[PDB]
Each structure stands twice: as C-alpha cells, then as structure tokens.
Design a protein around this ligand. Structure first.
Ligand SMILES: N#Cc1cnn(-c2ccc(Cl)cc2)c1N
Ligand SMILES: N#Cc1cnn(-c2ccc(Cl)cc2)c1N
Ligand SMILES: N#Cc1cnn(-c2ccc(Cl)cc2)c1N
Ligand SMILES: N#Cc1cnn(-c2ccc(Cl)cc2)c1N
Ligand SMILES: N#Cc1cnn(-c2ccc(Cl)cc2)c1N
Ligand SMILES: N#Cc1cnn(-c2ccc(Cl)cc2)c1N
Lengths: 182, 182, 182, 182, 182, 182
C-alpha cells in the first residue's frame, strides 16, 4: 500500500495454540464448493469474491489460511484441510500439518500446506500421520487441480514440483509467524 | 432511533474504489437460496433473519447492498448482482452497474440497482454492458419476482414501473454516498 | 482462564429487546446440516469447528445461543429454533420460547430451550404457543437425537429427563442474563 | 393420436389398493426442486422435460399423478403430495386424499387433488385429516403458486376457484379410474 | 401372495457377472440422503416410498440389493456400498464384498453385506480388501445407525451382533442366488 | 457380444420426431453433478455406475445420448445439452443441434454433439442459433473439461480438435440413425 494512502475479525485470531505444530486455519473455500474463489480481506474481516474460476474446477479439499502469518509472497501461509465433510466458509479450525505441496506460478514459489483437524476435533483423520498416508488418488487429484484450475486465467500458470513433509511445513509456519511481526 | 435511547464489520467497508462506477456490494441473499429474507444489521455487523417469505418465492439473482450509502428510504442502496453461481451470504463483491429496476411499494419509491461483478472477477458477465443485454427471460423473472414475492405479506404491495440505465444507477450511488455522510 | 494468561461481533448483540420473553438467538448449527458441530467463539467473533459428530447424526432443528447470557455450566443459554427452512449459520434471529428440554450429561445439568421465531418473522410457526403444540414426532426426534448423537464420544453420555414450559424457559433466560453481568 | 399413426413402467402400476380412498401416486416433481417441469410419458415409461418454468417458481409440495386414471382433460388425475422431505422424482407413494384445489385455465377446468402419504408410511402427516388441517400459510402458498407460476407462459392463465373436500377428491378418483378403462 | 390373487426393470438385471465374487447392486438409498426409506418394487420396476424414518437418521453408506437373489427373510440380499460420493437411487453398480454385518430384529436374522465398487469403477476403494480395512469410525457409525434408526418405529428393534468376512458374504450371495430359482 | 453368449426402457424411445433436426436426448449425467460417470445400459434400461472420475472433474453441461442411434465407435450419438438448471438423470428432453466438438482419444474419433432444448421447452436458450452463440467462457470450459477429465485414467487421453456446425451435427445424427437399423 502506497505511502500517501497508508496515512480485526481475522487478525485477532491467534496463529496457533502451540506453534508450529498446533495452529489455526480460517476457511476461505470449502471442499467441493461451486467454482468461486473467495479470499479473506484481513483489513475488512470479510470474505471477498476473488474470481469465478475459468475452468470451473472445484477445490477437492478445504482451503484457508493461518491468521497472523506472512509468507514470502506477501500473503498468509495457505493450507489445504482435509475433512470428511466440507467446512463452513469463514469458520476456524484447530489443525495439524501433514506436509506440503511445492509448486511455482508465474509470480514465484507457492507452497500449500496440507493439514487435518486436531485429533479430538476430527477422529476420522487421526490415522493420517504424514503426507504419505493421504490416499494416492487424492494427492493425485490435488496435484491435478493445482496444475489445471488456472488453465483459463490469461497470463497465469502453475507448475507442481512435488511433496514435502512435516518439518518443511513447520518451517513455513515458523517463518510466516516471524514475518508477520516484522 | 429515539433521542432517549440514542444516548463496524459492514460500515468500514468502502462504498467503492472509484465511485460511482466502481463500487462494492455486500451480499445478503444468494440467488436461488431457500425463501428466507436476510437483512444486514449494520450496527451489529451480522445478517438478521428478516422474514420467511410468505409466497416462498426465491431471489432469482443475488441480493445485497452498498455499504456507506443511505438512500431516501433510510436504507443503503440495494443491488441485484447477477453471477453464474450464487454468492456467499455476507461476502463482498466488486461490482459495476447495468442500470436499475424502478418500482414503488406501499411505503414509497424503491429502486433496485442491477449489477454484475467487475470484469476481472467475473469474465462470464463481461459481455453485459447495459440493462438491455440482460436476457429478456431473466429481466421478466426479476420483474415478476418483485411484483409477487410479497403477495402474502399483509398490508404490503409492490408495483414495478420499468427499467432505467447506468446514469440513473450512478445518480443513485452518487446521492446515497453523499447522504451517508450527512 | 488462568490468572497469568488473563493478564465483539457476538457479545455486542443484545440478549433481547424485551427479556425474558423477547430474545435474540445467534445460530451455530442449521437444522439438517452435515454432522459437524460448530460453537461460537465469543472472544473471537467466529464459529469454530468443534467436533465431527461420531455418530454422524444431524441436528433436527436449528441450534444456537442467546448472546450476553451465562448459564450455570459456564456457557450461554442454548436454544433449539424450529423453522420451516434451515437458518444460516452465524445469522441472528428474534425468538420466543416454547419451553425446554431437561437433560443431564456426564458434566451436570444441561437444558436446551426450545424456541421459534417472532411471529412477524415466521408466520409459519405462529400457531405454536407452547411445547405441547410441537408435533409428537418431532419432539421424539429431538429427544432421540440428544440421547444418541454423542453415543460415540468416548467418556460422554446424555440422559433426557423430559420437557418443561415457558416459565421454566424464562427463568433460564432471566438467570443467564443476570449471571453474565456478574 | 391420429388414425394413420396409431396403426409399461407406469401403466402397470395399480391406481390403488383400495379405491378411491387408498391410491398410488407416481411423483413427477419433488417439492422445492429447481424450476423445471417434468411430465411422465406413460407410453415411454420415462419422465420428460416439459418446460423450464418462465417465472422460475418452484412447486411448494410434491407433484405427481395416479396411474391408470384418465381425467376429463385427457390426462391422469393430478395430485399434490405433502411430505416432510421432498420425494424422489419417479418414485411411487401410497397416499390418501385430503381434498382438492379447484381451478380453471385457458383450456378448461383443472382440479389438483391434495394428498398425504398413508399413515404407516408417513407418521408426520397422520394428524392431517382434511384440507382444513393443512396450515393456512401453506394453502395460501399453493394457491399463489398456481395463480402465478405460469404468469410468463404466453397464452396461458390460471384462476384458482377455491378448495374442496374428500368426497370431491374421491369422485375425481372414481371417475378417473372408470374413464381409463373406457 | 395369496392363491386367489396370484392367479422386469429389476428382475432382468443379472445377479452378477461372476458369482459370488463379482455381483451387481441396484441402489435404493444413497449415502447421506434425506431420511426417507425407499424399497425397490421388483414386480413394478420402481422405487417405492417405504417409510419416513422416525428418528430422521440417514444412511451413512449407500444401500441397495442384488437382483435375482432371495434371502431367507423373503427379500433379496441387502448390501451397503461404500463410495466417495453418493450413488444415484435406481442406478446399478458392479461390486465386490468386504464382509457382512450380522444383526437380528424383531422378525429374525438380518445380515447386511458390506461392499465396494469394482476396482476399475472406483479406484478410491481398491485399497479396501476386507471388512477390517474399513475405518473404525465408519464401522462404528454403521453399527450405531442400525442399532438406532428404527428406535421410533413402534414394535421394532434391531440388535447388531458383529461383523463377518468375505466367505460369509459369499455364502449369503451363493444361497440367495440359489433360492431365487427355487 | 460373443456368438456363444448372444444365443426396452431406452431403445423404445424414438431417436426423434423429425430427424435429424428435431431429436430426443436421454440424460445420463446432469451438469455440475458430483464426479461420477453414469452410462445408460440400453439392454437393461438402467443407468450404470461407470467410473468415479479420477480428476474429480464435473460435467459443465448435461450429458446424454440419442436413443436408436449407433455411432462408428459402437455407441449412440453423444450429446451435451445446455440448460439453465441441471436436468434429471434418466429424463428425456426434446433437443436441437448447435454443432459439435471434434476430438479423438486413444481409441479413435469421438465427437460430442452440442445441443439445447426445443424452444418451447426452454425459452432461455432460444437465442442460441449456432455453436458460435455459445459464450466463449463456456466453450472454453467444455474444451478444457474434455482435455483434462480423464487425465488420471491410466492408458487414456483425449485431444480436442475444435468445433463444427449444424450440418456436421446433422450428418452425425443421420448416420447414427441409419447404422442402428443395420
Ligand atoms: N476426511 C476424511 C476421511 C478420513 N477417513 N476417511 C475415509 C476413509 C476410508 C473410507 Cl472407506 C471412508 C472414509 C475420510 N474420508
Ligand atoms: N451470470 C451469468 C452468466 C453470464 N453468461 N451466462 C451464460 C450465458 C449463456 C449460456 Cl448458454 C450460459 C451462461 C451466464 N449464466
Ligand atoms: N417450522 C415450521 C413449520 C410450521 N408449520 N409447519 C408445517 C406444518 C404442517 C405441514 Cl403439512 C407443513 C408445515 C412447519 N414445518
Ligand atoms: N409434511 C409434513 C409435516 C407434517 N407435520 N409437519 C410439521 C409441523 C409442525 C412443525 Cl413445527 C414441523 C413440522 C410437517 N412439516
Ligand atoms: N469411499 C471412499 C473412500 C476411499 N478412500 N477414501 C478416503 C480415505 C482417506 C481420505 Cl483423507 C479421504 C478419502 C474414501 N472416502
Ligand atoms: N442455459 C442457459 C442459459 C440461457 N441464457 N442464459 C443466461 C444468459 C445470460 C445471463 Cl446474465 C444469465 C443466463 C443461460 N444461463
């Protein structure tokens, strides 16, 4: 934001109760929702209609961010949260990391964390200890989704590099948390 | 509100980035949602259950308002926002005007602006330059909806007078913006 | 909350326009929603994913709370709100009491108020004057739901004791309102 | 069908186990379904897309017909079936009559029977003994729906005359059954 | 059916391409559908509205039967089919057995087969080789569902005895197939 | 089907009332339905669960076939039917051609016809006279969908060659109709 011009609901949510391993995710896009991309406006405390997805492709898992984090790209750490039923847009969930999906787009690197709810919240996912426990068919779907959903956004492209584990996820959380407080 | 008694989430959203032509709409009622009327409480920053619609008729397009506007009737400027998928109640969208629907009810005039998302947000609607580009079948549906949805609200009635264009829409935005700051 | 650590959107909603008989309910769980339990975080002003319900059972009526009340268990007064269509999670509704469902769980007593919207809001429910007007099949469903939904939460149990009327509901509202202001 | 040209799944369903009081209804349009009108093709044994409803108005109750009946207008006896959840299009339900809605359109009289499932099938509706037990708000909605849904079908109109009871319903069933066998 | 009275779409579907291990299931009730019980009428070739479930509980997995089988209770072999998205009521699916749920009701034994689609049809479930691979939380849900869904059907009760494996499933298929041809 | 082994509901539906221009389409997959591929079994008269789509991608328009046609690949002529609301799986619709999408897969050519309902059925689409009237964003989505939906079916691939008009569509109908009667 420009000098001249520069002259709550989200930013007051703790990044996590016990970082980096125990963190909070505000949901922006439910799994399987109609192909509209919402992005939290953290100044306004509201979800903003970002884009009607050109390919009409839908998020195969829930999509959100960790409040009070600032990633290298200037946005909060992004998280995919797997659940047995879609989560409400604008809700918050206690989560734990399984790893990450490494990718780069026309603008630089872009990693999305892969997460599940805390075990007490979601017993259905407690079995998932790391990225490699996530079913092959689903990891494939997610990789395909990121490779293709922006196929019809002019000037954009996405390349998926592959997966990473929990340390890598935690470093991302660690650094994002740091950056947000300068 | 009475003298004796008179002794954020919505009202801090800018009316628009470049008024009157580029404005923001907070969504109250998604297109095709079950026949319950919500109204934003701008004091409380929450959607309020206003009415279970007597006829059970549903909004054929998304319905919302422009924050920080005050129309002659004492409420913000109302907007119908056409999209290819319903929008989330309580989300905000960047919009542009196509015109208006002129009508009057038992309480006086009532015009609803007709709008679509900004072109970058919704490429699907970029083709729509003015009210006359909106399909006849849909304009008819909208006119019918406003004529009939309140058919079973005792003491109420609505009469649709016809359509108007972008200047008329902009004047409404212009005046609403002015009124809100006294 | 511990001494050491202790060193808006919900709590600024009035408990009611004319207590105890005319009160407000913020909706946490819509009737018939997928089996995920949300709980309002009144500090954060957001709905939190509380639990994926083990039995996968769904709320047969809308579920919420009255802001600015504090019940003996340390939480706001809980309310079941019957409507002909599910209400939006995080919306507020003007309600009136029909009575209560008395029950106890592993932690102590737990009563849920049973309510409907104000007559002007919902003409469909205006016929319901007291708990005994609520259809037998539905009261049975609600009692069954509370008896069984937590069947697969380890260490938990719920026993339903039976119904009570409007005075009992009002006393609950009365006391909850009092407790919240010390 | 013309002489020259004239040279199972539905027509083999009994009209009823104990006519006229105990009859069967094949569902064509579920309550609250998207505004598309289906009509059973009794020759082909399939539902046919009849019309995208111009007003976009939806059936407030389930809509179907009694197989092996032929009403004066050349079609089977029509039935509105009230249920607590919409019924599957193309399913069959055991029903009992509450009465009828008398109306006429541009083509002549048109009465729709009003029905509910057999008590053992639907205990929720067992309380409804006659047309006058059906809630006022719902009867009003149904009358409004028939008055308005065809508002935007060119050359069509519908006028609702009022209600009738079970004898009238039974006579309709009685005659329809007779006519179908010459 | 009585002597005096006794004087296609389903019954012409093969029980299986390679019995007992490779069999067909016609779906009657999709997983998570609204709490209405459908039952295929094999004489009429249509789904019949059987019951509005008193508890309002929903099937946690898809429910159907194997055509051209006759189980001891006089009905076809029943099957629960697990899939990542609910299946269409009245569709047919190629399936393979994982085992069975043994239970008895007021009328005698009642076993439900547990199945998944053929691997080529559903790669998502190919990992499931036997009943013990099905997640604990889901088996628990299914057992709870059968224990409770009929809680409010007067005169009925269900007791779940426990699980069994593929041989037991196959014997059920084997015998059902035999019985159907006398 | 092999010699040794070779020793209604769909095949008795006319291909069209006035071929090739006025034809019938039986719907197999509704627009926007969950990512499960159904295929009509024309022997059995039922929809069969064909595949859980690996990419989880959904049909952006309705998908079906013209009964009593046999295309070069051994299946009926395939049709994409555009409508303002998804159509019921297993319903039949009166349609007219806009053109075709030419593509080839690992098995040979594969063209899908693009169609809309008859004007009287769907006034919303009457404006569409040819393939070039279909919005660019939608044609792009459809082309992308066919290019990518099978990305995760092992051994499969699809290449889209481009569009064709009504004569080409009609020839396809013409030949398919011929082939079906030897
Ligand atoms: N989210 C989630 C989740 C966790 N376990 N499952 C799961 C696994 C296997 C089967 Cl057969 C069903 C559900 C999920 N869908
Ligand atoms: N909103 C919107 C929108 C913009 N274009 N369309 C559109 C137009 C024609 C067709 Cl066949 C489909 C969609 C919409 N539904
Ligand atoms: N909520 C509610 C409500 C109020 N009246 N009804 C109602 C009663 C009878 C019938 Cl047949 C339909 C709706 C409701 N579902
Ligand atoms: N169908 C139906 C039906 C029967 N009783 N009810 C009903 C009545 C009152 C209330 Cl409060 C809820 C449901 C229905 N919706
Ligand atoms: N049906 C099914 C099925 C098969 N695998 N899964 C599955 C397992 C784990 C996760 Cl995390 C998601 C889906 C299903 N839901
Ligand atoms: N199907 C269809 C169809 C036909 N016209 N439209 C349409 C076009 C423009 C707009 Cl703004 C909305 C709908 C459709 N969605």
């Amino acid at each position: 934001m420009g000098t001249l011009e520069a002259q709550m609901s989200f930013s007051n949510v703790p990044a996590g109760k016990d970082l980096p391993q125990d963190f909070n995710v505000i949901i922006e896009i439910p799994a399987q929702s109609e192909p509209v991309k919402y992005e939290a406006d953290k100044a306004l405390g509201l979800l903003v209609v970002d884009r009607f997805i050109g390919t009409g492709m839908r998020y195969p898992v829930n999509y959100g961010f960790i409040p009070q984090t600032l990633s290298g790209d200037g946005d909060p750490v992004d998280v995919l949260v797997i659940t047995p039923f879609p989560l409400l847009a604008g809700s918050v969930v206690r989560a734990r990391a399984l790893g990450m999906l490494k990718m780069t787009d026309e603008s630089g690197v872009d990693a999305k964390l892969v997460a599940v709810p805390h075990d007490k919240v979601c017993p259905m996912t407690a079995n998932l200890k790391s990225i490699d426990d996530v079913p092959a068919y689903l990891k494939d779907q997610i990789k395909h989704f990121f490779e293709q959903y922006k196929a019809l956004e002019k000037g954009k492209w996405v390349k998926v590099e592959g997966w990473d584990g929990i340390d890598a996820a935690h470093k991302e959380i660690t650094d994002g948390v740091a950056n947000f407080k300068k």
